[PDB]
Amino acid sequence: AMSLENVAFNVVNKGHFDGQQGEVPVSIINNTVYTKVDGVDVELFENKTTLPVNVAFELWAKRNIKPVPEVKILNNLGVDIAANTVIWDYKRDAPAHISTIGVCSMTDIAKKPTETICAPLTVFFDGRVDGQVDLFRNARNGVLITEGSVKGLQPSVGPKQASLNGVTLIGEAVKTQFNYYKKVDGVVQQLPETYFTQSRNLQEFKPRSQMEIDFLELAMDEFIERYKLEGYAFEHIVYGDFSHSQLGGLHLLIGLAKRFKESPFELEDFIPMDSTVKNYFITDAQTGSSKCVCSVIDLLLDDFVEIIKSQDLSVVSKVVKVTIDYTEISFMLWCKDGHVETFYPKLQ
Amino acid sequence: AMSLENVAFNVVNKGHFDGQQGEVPVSIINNTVYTKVDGVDVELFENKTTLPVNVAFELWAKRNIKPVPEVKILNNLGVDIAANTVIWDYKRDAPAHISTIGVCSMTDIAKKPTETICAPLTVFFDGRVDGQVDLFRNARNGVLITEGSVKGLQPSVGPKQASLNGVTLIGEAVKTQFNYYKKVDGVVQQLPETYFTQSRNLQEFKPRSQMEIDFLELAMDEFIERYKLEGYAFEHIVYGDFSHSQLGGLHLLIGLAKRFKESPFELEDFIPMDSTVKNYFITDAQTGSSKCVCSVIDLLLDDFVEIIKSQDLSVVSKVVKVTIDYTEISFMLWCKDGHVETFYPKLQ
Amino acid sequence: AMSLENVAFNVVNKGHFDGQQGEVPVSIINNTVYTKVDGVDVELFENKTTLPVNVAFELWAKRNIKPVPEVKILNNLGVDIAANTVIWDYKRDAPAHISTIGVCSMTDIAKKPTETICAPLTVFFDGRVDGQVDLFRNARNGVLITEGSVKGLQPSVGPKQASLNGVTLIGEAVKTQFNYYKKVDGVVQQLPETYFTQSRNLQEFKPRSQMEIDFLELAMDEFIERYKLEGYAFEHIVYGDFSHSQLGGLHLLIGLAKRFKESPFELEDFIPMDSTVKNYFITDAQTGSSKCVCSVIDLLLDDFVEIIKSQDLSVVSKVVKVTIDYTEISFMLWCKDGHVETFYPKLQ
Amino acid sequence: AMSLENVAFNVVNKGHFDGQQGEVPVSIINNTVYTKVDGVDVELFENKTTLPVNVAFELWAKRNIKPVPEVKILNNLGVDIAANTVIWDYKRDAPAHISTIGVCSMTDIAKKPTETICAPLTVFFDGRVDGQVDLFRNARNGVLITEGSVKGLQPSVGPKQASLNGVTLIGEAVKTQFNYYKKVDGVVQQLPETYFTQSRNLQEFKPRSQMEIDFLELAMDEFIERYKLEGYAFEHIVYGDFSHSQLGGLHLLIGLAKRFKESPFELEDFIPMDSTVKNYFITDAQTGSSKCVCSVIDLLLDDFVEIIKSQDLSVVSKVVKVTIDYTEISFMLWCKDGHVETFYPKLQ
Amino acid sequence: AMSLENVAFNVVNKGHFDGQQGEVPVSIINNTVYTKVDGVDVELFENKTTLPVNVAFELWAKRNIKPVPEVKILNNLGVDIAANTVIWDYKRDAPAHISTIGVCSMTDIAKKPTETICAPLTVFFDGRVDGQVDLFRNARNGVLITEGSVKGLQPSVGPKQASLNGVTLIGEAVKTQFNYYKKVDGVVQQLPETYFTQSRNLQEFKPRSQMEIDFLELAMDEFIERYKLEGYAFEHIVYGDFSHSQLGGLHLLIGLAKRFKESPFELEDFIPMDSTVKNYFITDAQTGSSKCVCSVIDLLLDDFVEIIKSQDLSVVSKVVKVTIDYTEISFMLWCKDGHVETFYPKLQ
């Protein structure tokens, strides 16, 4: 018995859609859902999606309120749709996937993921939901997450962190470390060995290793010396070069996080979405040093150090491919006389 | 001589509507009022109400710029409309009442509160305005506020704080403590003995008593011991329980304010309006502990302590009714073997 | 080969319009430009202007990404249009000028500033662009900025600071100090001797002179005594008077910046645009002291002190005219028995 | 090199999209595409679809301008998408199918109908386009139309009429009679024996048989007598019954067209779309006789007469199923003592 | 004392803006101006322009309600703006010119046409308004219309018809034949010898000459024979050729009006604006014969006959330039062995 007034009743009384019966007066004005409370209209939801107001309302209301894989991870695995849930992209304030399976009448392509229509799509299955594991086994294309083992299937350990109601976190009171499984054209696929991004903010940045604690605490010449990083262009790549009109390096988030503490800067996030490599239009307030496309990756410093030190510095320029968040990240490695000049992740 | 271009003239030249004569070029695009300044369009107002753009503009312009009762208080007293003013709800960015009395042509139901049409409505009268007290005496239903005594009428002392241009404050340079009076079907009504909420923010929270200073300063086991709060589930009710997937207790704002200092958390205010009991969808960033409907009341700790200690802990579950902000707040009191288990305010 | 899909390609791949060939799928919904990335719509731009969505998109994309004069300065010089660029007003999130010259088909009045149509307009020329200086020489009305000397023309040294991608800054890695030149009806005009506003924020305020360091550090009676400011109403004019319902003085930004550190206050910027004199509707949270139109100017204290001390305190009230940011700022000077009572900049 | 400004260039210069190179200035306001002509904005297209303005613009521009099957026919055959064209539904002012195949970047699911994604969809193929017949032969699901024979496949002769730019017509200067072919799960399907609706206007109605010429020229009792239609409730079913508050019968278009010739009535088309059975809320201006759901089918009278005379009138009420426009139309047949009472098509 | 509520008062009470004092309650929702009448909102104006709702409202309200030159004529003469009036384009439901002179604050570039800003623009002056003739004499660029002679200036007799409140008519109770005068760079210009379009409707078409009365009454072969039009491709050019898929000829309105009398067709006016040559996407319902760009000109037959008979039929294809409505209309003349094949006006 699905209806606008019912979804709104659940939003008012329960915080989200919770299958409760009841109705509340609703009015729709300028991409906004309002409800009459004490004789006045109160804003329930402001549609920031490309779907009709009432549709987006229902999908938001019916969003997954448990720790779920970060959108970047799902996208990288080629997930097209979710089985009997809505993965809400809090970075875009919109559903992470266009269509649904047994969620809402206006967006559903099927009621069950077993319908012939779902076969060409990579359907996301949540092992924590009863019967979803068997649905993955029976689907032509899909991605499966589980808290534990799945009899017979070879697991891929995923990132430590998951998104819980927009908050990316490493679960203490909840489990955020899942086991990943993927199928392509009815065949289980062996996922690669991968590094994971840490998903940290510029402002609330915290080191996650001793070498990262040493980075923010120690001086430039001091840190390079301690971790034998001489001739690896750490000066340029990580810390940044603000001496000229075009901002030099500054491709690791830890680097941006150190500089932000000294003096602020504008980070124009011109493609606001979740991705392994982010591109920002940076402008330094102190210096005037700016760069239109500054590619930033949040790799744990120790991982970046392992990657850079694992390269052959004999050629002027080459493409270095690194498996990060289950996707191939192309990095440009620029060298000169056996030392690094620059090493930036590519946009792609 | 009321007009759009005149209201805009006053907004530009005086900050709000101030009865000044004059006009400025105005353009209306996408629920926004613009004015031409130095040959370009400057944004005067962005309509966030359910009223037409130009109407909301006028009501906002004509808002009360003196300390006025907080919307929660007015709503609790059953105020339907205001006499010859606009009470602006800064929490909703909209007028607190749908219709007006001698304010604007498009929203006025009457020019004067004495019109037969106003009789069934509880009209708000401001004693500080000449002739308003006599209008209350002559109205069938109403709420009156005064700075001082009203000959013959029995007063109800209101909260210490009032809202001045969106800022809730206890007046130093202005009076924010009013005397309340109410009429129902032409009869003066004796308002009840009530406790008042403190109307504090999560982030800019400040203790207002020694016991509240002791709460934020002292440790858990230390505070309970000092104020003889043993077996009153203060651990659960006030401080919060983040050990499991569902967040335990945390119903007093002072509690949320202590936790916010240690580690941040998301407070999803899903019904954004002013009320005695607020409901939030809380998610703890550190733990992963979350709760869809967490009812929060900002009572001065000493008042909450007086309320909890004034109860009979002999029965498993009962409804405890407390007069707060002139309304009956139903509280659920859960007990076991002569001690408290939990005590939360109900949504209602 | 100018098109929506191409502008969007450049925005995605390069951060702004950079003359690159290529196209990306674009969709236009509710004054917003979206692009399909990984099968979902991502928000590229939210039109906050009075121009059509796609037009504003192009003008924003084609904005000047070099340090440019602050909009207040350009407006004061009477600039109507810019030659072959877009000066973006980041304070209004809109183009600083209605029409363009060789930028966009929908807003262009001419392709080149030499067209007969441009003659009555004061066209902005950027000396740093090849051929622009000669275009100024040949234009009937205009404003020219250069980093260096222009053979034969008498220069006017401009402010130390410029706006770089919305950030107002004194350039270290870039030049922000330009030479100004102006033409009126084909004749070079001698610009006046002027003081410049410092363009500082309330929250990130920093002193720019010893006397300003002394202001924030020292006490009221202490500072007045040290800088011989007795009988200049510095108490009232700069620091502010919060004792009564109407807020007294507080017309210099440094004054507001000191008070903000002690206790916060609401600054309602009711005409959000860049100007030499700003008007705010101030409300003090601590006191309840408020004022609808509080005129605020950010003059370096030493400059304000030079201005106030340079006046004749013999008459009750007079208009004091001060050249600030190339415009005449009328100040009201109120006196009594050879001392100052108040000295505020006028709205105008 | 697909772009908004190019599509608009083709619309202006050629009438629709015709692969021509060039651009025109375009502005998007509301849900309307405008172009600057002689310095003013001219309306090119008003988006009446649920797709973004610029997307719908492109699909409209890229519509099929040849005689194509009427949307009702395609829907009845279960067509989901069209191969390398856009079938425009002029009754809904929107594309007849949500997604496209090699038409537009924002709606394309595939570039070619051979992609694995298209397999579950019934793809429409136009034999008149080179290589489309062979694409049908290799597609899993599909509908094919041809002007002539297809080696090996058994044809189904379709309706005499087709829609040419919104005009439903029987082609004289063009061919509108096609041969239909259908595939389901890789198997050619033998289409049923069907009657076709005539797709006539109530206003511009033209008889297509002698019995229709007789119906319009002759009197009621006269016609019934000539074509031996006694006891077949023709008076009720075909001509209307306006004697009571609820309008009796009037289910055949010729009947409506005859009444309209005499007295006009209101036909509220509450589900505006193309269908075999249409439902109207009729209100007769002469009599005041009205009916909420009056199901109307435009069958050639001779066909209706063949259908009604081919029934068993022994039972009070039964469902009569008639193959019309390749779909099963359920008709309710109401009888009494061996004669007809009423016979209406079901809405569904 | 110009304001929204005043303009609306005049619209309600007087039909348009008539300088009357008074105000009416107005509400603006979407792009529509409403007024409260008997307690309900009544639609005054639906903005179909690219200007803000309230601005377009004022310009519409302030439109010229006297017979004025048809927009096509003004455009052809290169009129950019009108002096102290608004010429409303009823074909576009928008003002014919972007800016105004002493009409509305939001669109005015000047208060009087004598301002230096107006000099580069061709300003329209109406001789029937006091002092306008003298303003033309002193303006640098302009177009003047008068009912009578102007001392010293040589007149150009204009079309017989003018637009009176959207109705194009030859005045009986009013004068619609004006005298045209034009100035370019301060010099009076001698306007060319021109033919005029008749500006007739396809539906309400009326013959304006005996040869037009003969065209409509007589048969094809009959007419051609009577007016010695053999070998001038009249059959093709004037009457249509509906025998093939692409509609042949049909470039003269009288020809369309004759066909429409017999069989109806769809005329898709894809560039809805006033022009000398109109382009339609025609689809003949009888034959199915269609053409994307069918250029149609409404020339009095006798004029067309004079034009075609005045050509040299010796070359296969050439551009024939005809002065129509003061502009050069390029016509394509296609010939073969001394006779005409086709002769169509060019779209451009």
Whether chain C has a CB inside 8 Å of the CB on A296: the answer is no
Residue of C nearest to B167 (CA): C285
Last residue of a domain, which of C49, C65, C81?
Answer: C65
Distance CA B281, CA B250 (A): 12
- Residue E116 to residue C117, Cβ atoms within 8 A: no
Q: Is E324 helix (H, G, I), strand (E, B) or coil?
A: strand
Angle (CA) B23-B28-B29 rounded to 5° is 155
Any chains having at least 3 CB pairs less than 8 A from chain A are B, C, D
Q: Which pair of tokens denotes residue E205?
A: 């078409």
- Binding-site entries of C for uracil: 291-295, 342-346
Task: Give the number of C-alpha atoms closer than 13 A to the C-alpha of residue B301, restricted to the C-beta side.
Answer: 25
Cβ atoms E181, E209 nearer than 8 A: no
Indicate if A186 and A251 belong to the same structural domain. no
Indicate if A154 and A260 belong to the same structural domain. no
Torsion of CA E122, E128, E129, E130, to 10 degrees: 110
Strand partners, B100: B108
Whether chain D has a CB inside 8 Å of the CB on C6: the answer is yes
Residues of D in contact with E286 (CB under 8 A): 169, 172
Q: Which of A264, A286, A292 sits opposite C14 (nearest CB)?
A: A292
Show Cβ contacts of residue C89 under 8 Å, excluding neighbours closer than 6 positions: B40, C71, C95, C96, C273, C274
Q: Which pair of tokens denotes residue E74?
A: 């003004």
Q: Cα distance from A288 to chain C (closest Cα, Å)?
A: 5
Distance CA A138, CA E198 (A): 73
Determination approach: X-ray
Cβ atoms E199, E67 nearer than 8 A: no
Cβ atoms C334, C341 nearer than 8 A: yes
Q: Cα distance from A246 to chain C (closest Cα, Å)?
A: 9
H or E stretch including D95?
A: strand D94-95
Query: What does the buried/exposed string (b/e) look like for C4-16 if buried means 16 or more CB atoms within 10 Å of the residue's CB?
Result: bbbbbbbbbbbbb
Q: Which of A12, A13, A169 sits opposite B288 (nearest CB)?
A: A169
Whether chain E has a CB inside 8 Å of the CB on C154: the answer is no
Q: Which of D50, D52, D117 sits opposite A120 (nearest CB)?
A: D117
Q: Cα distance from A11 to chain D (closest Cα, Å)?
A: 26
Window 82-101 of C, Cβ < 8 Å to E:
none
Q: Which of B89, B266, B270 sits opposite A11 (nearest CB)?
A: B270
Indicate if B196 and B296 belong to the same structural domain. yes
Q: Is B110 left (phi over 0), alpha (psi -120 to 50) or beta?
A: beta
Residue E346, marked binder: yes
Residue E104, marked binder: no
Indicate if C201 and C342 belong to the same structural domain. yes
Residues of D in contact with E260 (CB under 8 A): none
Any chains having at least 3 CB pairs less than 8 A from chain C are A, B, D, E
Cβ atoms D255, D265 nearer than 8 A: no
- Resolution for this model in angstroms, one decimal place? 2.9
Indicate if E206 and E297 belong to the same structural domain. yes
Cβ atoms B68, B125 nearer than 8 A: no
Q: Cα distance from E35 to chain B (closest Cα, Å)?
A: 9
* Residue found under tokens 């309706």: D159
Which of C75, C290, C348 would best serve as a mutation to test chain B binding (most B beta carbons within 10 A)? C290
Q: Which of E264, E268, E288 sits opposite D171 (nearest CB)?
A: E288
Query: What does the buried/exposed string (b/e) look like for B273-309 if buried means 16 or more CB atoms within 10 Å of the residue's CB?
Result: bbbbbbbbbbbbebbbbbbbbbbbbbbbbebbbebbe
Q: Cα distance from B187 to chain A (closest Cα, Å)?
A: 23
Residue E295, marked binder: yes
Residue B294, marked binder: yes
Give yes or no: E291 in active site.
Answer: yes
Cβ atoms E33, E45 nearer than 8 A: yes
Strand partners, D328: D323
Cβ atoms B333, B318 nearer than 8 A: yes
Cβ atoms D48, D94 nearer than 8 A: yes
| Residues of B that are catalytic | 236, 251, 291
Residue of B nearest to E29 (CA): B52
H or E stretch including A312?
A: none
H or E stretch including D154?
A: none
| Residue type (1 letter), E70 | E
Give the C:D interface size as CB pairs under 8 Å.
Answer: 56
- Residue D39 to residue E98, Cβ atoms within 8 A: yes
Q: Is C78 left (phi over 0), alpha (psi -120 to 50) or beta?
A: left
Distance CA D58, CA D41 (A): 19
For residue E174, give Cα distances in angstroms to C256, E17, E146, E171. Answer: 68, 21, 13, 5
Distance CA A113, CA A118 (A): 6
The one-character DSSP state at E246 is B
Indicate if D184 and D201 belong to the same structural domain. no
- Residue E271 to residue D12, Cβ atoms within 8 A: yes
Indicate if D205 and D175 belong to the same structural domain. no
- Residue B34 to residue E23, Cβ atoms within 8 A: no
Residue of D nearest to C40 (CA): D106
The one-character DSSP state at D297 is B
* Residue found under tokens 């996650």: A208
E strand segments, E158-305: 162-164, 167-169, 179-184, 187-189, 240-241, 248-249, 265-268, 278-284, 290-296
- Binding-site entries of D for uracil: 291-295, 342-346
Task: Output Rg (C-alpha) for chain D, integer angstroms.
Answer: 23
Indicate if A207 and A342 belong to the same structural domain. yes
Q: Which pair of tokens denotes residue E148?
A: 């009578």
- Helical segments of chain E, H only: 4-14, 53-61, 71-76, 132-138, 210-217, 220-226, 234-237, 253-262, 301-309
Indicate the number of domains in chain B.
Answer: 3
Short-list A132, A131, A125, A127, CA closest to A175: A127
Q: Is C189 left (phi over 0), alpha (psi -120 to 50) or beta?
A: beta
- Residue B167 to residue C283, Cβ atoms within 8 A: yes
Whether chain D has a CB inside 8 Å of the CB on A53: the answer is no
Whether chain B has a CB inside 8 Å of the CB on E53: the answer is yes
Q: Cα distance from E50 to chain C (closest Cα, Å)?
A: 8
Window 246-285 of B, Cβ < 8 Å to A:
264, 266, 268, 270-273, 279, 281, 283-285
Last residue of a domain, which of E171, E191, E211?
Answer: E191
* Class of residue B134 by CB neighbours under 10 A (exposed 0-12, middle 13-18, buried 19+): exposed
Whether chain B has a CB inside 8 Å of the CB on A30: the answer is yes
Cβ atoms B3, E5 nearer than 8 A: yes
Q: Phi, psi at residue C142, to the nearest 5°?
A: 180, 170
- Residue E54 to residue B28, Cβ atoms within 8 A: yes
Counting other chains too, the contacts that B244-250 makes at CB distance below 8 Å and 24 or more residues apart are B244/A173, B244/B289, B245/A173, B245/A174, B245/B288, B245/B289, B245/B290, B246/B289, B246/B290, B246/B291, B247/B282, B247/B284, B247/B289, B247/B290, B247/B291, B247/B294, B248/B342, B249/B342, B249/B344, B250/B282, B250/B291, B250/B294, B250/B296
Distance CA E333, CA E320 (A): 7
Whether chain D has a CB inside 8 Å of the CB on C52: the answer is yes
Show Cβ contacts of residue E165 under 8 Å, excluding neighbours closer than 6 positions: E65, E90
Which residues form the domain of A310? 192-348
Last residue of a domain, which of D65, D81, D113?
Answer: D65
- Residue C53 to residue D28, Cβ atoms within 8 A: yes
Any chains having at least 3 CB pairs less than 8 A from chain B are A, C, E
Short-list B330, B166, B87, B96, CA closest to A37: B96
Distance CA A347, CA C12 (A): 10
Distance CA C209, CA C216 (A): 11
Cβ atoms A164, B287 nearer than 8 A: no
Whether chain C has a CB inside 8 Å of the CB on E52: the answer is yes
Pairing of strands E81-82, E40-46: unpaired
Indicate if D154 and D204 belong to the same structural domain. no
Indicate if C74 and C167 belong to the same structural domain. yes
Whether chain E has a CB inside 8 Å of the CB on D11: the answer is yes
* Residue found under tokens 């606008």: A4
Cβ atoms E27, B54 nearer than 8 A: yes
- Binding-site entries of A for uracil: 291-295, 342-346
Show Cβ contacts of residue D334 under 8 Å, excluding neighbours closer than 6 positions: D316, D317, D340, D341, D342, D343
Q: Which of C11, C34, C39 sits opposite A98 (nearest CB)?
A: C39
Indicate if D346 and D207 belong to the same structural domain. yes
Longest dimension (CA), chain A: 76
Indicate if D127 and D30 belong to the same structural domain. no
